[PDB]
Design a protein around this ligand. Sequence first.
Ligand SMILES: *CCC(=O)N(C)[C@H]1C[C@@](C)(Oc2nc(-c3cnn(C)c3)cn3nccc23)C1
Length: 256
Amino acid sequence: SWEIDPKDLTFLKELGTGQFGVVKYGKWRGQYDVAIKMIKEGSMSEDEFIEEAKVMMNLSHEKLVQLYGVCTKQRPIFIITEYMANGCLLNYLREMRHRFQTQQLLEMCKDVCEAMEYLESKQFLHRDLAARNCLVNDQGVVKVSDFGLSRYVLKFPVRWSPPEVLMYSKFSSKSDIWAFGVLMWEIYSLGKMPYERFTNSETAEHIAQGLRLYRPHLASEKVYTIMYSCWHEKADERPTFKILLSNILDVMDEES
Ligand SMILES: *CCC(=O)N(C)[C@H]1C[C@@](C)(Oc2nc(-c3cnn(C)c3)cn3nccc23)C1
């Protein structure tokens, strides 16, 4: 049930390259748009991934990029996902022509938070949440992509990592929370790199001294309060995604 017959795939356009190599746009059975991730040999722990794919296919949420299945009886293996016509969220933010309103930026935050509250409720960590791992569909809806997939990569995301990850490799729901707050900073900064003048090493040292990302000027005070709450030093003092969704809904109502 997790397995797609590659004979049902028609490869139509190269979309570009991601973590595991090329991604292509194609059709399934001549009819349905799909994205086809072609997994470069040697890059992925494929047996482990295949087993986890069965779990990932039972995860269904409107704001999660859907895994349609995998093609595993060949090399390279393929991962078949929902096609997202407007590409990577990071590139989308950086296109100044969109002239985003802040209500649109908050909606992107809500989209991601909804997906992450769903993953939280399933006790599933993303482990690499960031604007580069979100995608945008033809209706401007942002969805969370490649959740959990860093576990199978045979370059660490220092700038999306809380102190207990940098110091001790303590991953938890609350390291996804921290990364979400950095993602909100990416959205309201229109895609700047977090800690844009620092190296990864400098970022980690400054985080150790309590530096935090500055308020992007497009974020209101209440929006900054939300992303800042994700960066409490003690992981247990950071909200859940359920609390964050409620805070985002509140600010959406106040700024409507
Ligand atoms: C920001 C990081 C990045 O560029 N990623 C992750 C790329 C992987 C990629 C090529 O995958 C997809 N790209 C598109 C797409 C790219 N450009 N347009 C106009 C659309 C669409 N798509 N749907 C699913 C995966 C994927 C983006």
